């Protein structure tokens with residue numbers, strides 16, 4: 001059984017903005033290597049850390065949450081997401097990145113993820129991605 005948290009709430013899916021999450025699956029071929037989103041004080045400020053290519057980089061995004069929907073902004077760049085699946089204990093979740101041809105991402109806790117729940121997120125990402133190639137950004141010499 002892989003029934004997640006219902007109704008899906010983005011604030012609950014991110015452990016109420018108290019835990020760091022890592023990008024582990026993505027249908028976007030330009031997905032950031034070793035991407036990790038973590039709390040950056042206090043809308044909801046988020047610090048994104050990633051690699052491009054050998055050197056580490058970091059940017060400050062501002063999240064605006066409303067139910068399952070998540071709007072992230074950096075300067076004048078805007079990205080819209082919807083948390084389409086969240087596991088029982090908020091250990092992982094799957095986002096639909098809203099654009100002309102939507103992408104799907106799997107995010108999981110940087111530390112303390114329950115295997116059965118993480119596997120349910122992997123299956124939900126497989127279902128939504130279907131045959132589209134799934135990048136594993138956390139396996140890029142992180």
Ligand SMILES: CCCCC/C=C\C[C@@H](O)/C=C/C=C/C=C\[C@@H](O)CCCC(=O)O
Nearest residue numbers: 014017021037038039046048059072095107
């Ligand atoms: C209070 C801490 C919150 C941590 C939660 C992190 C990710 C959740 C996940 O569902 C949402 C991800 C949103 C990503 C938004 C933008 C990224 O594409 C930016 C990548 C880095 C960049 O290119 O600058």
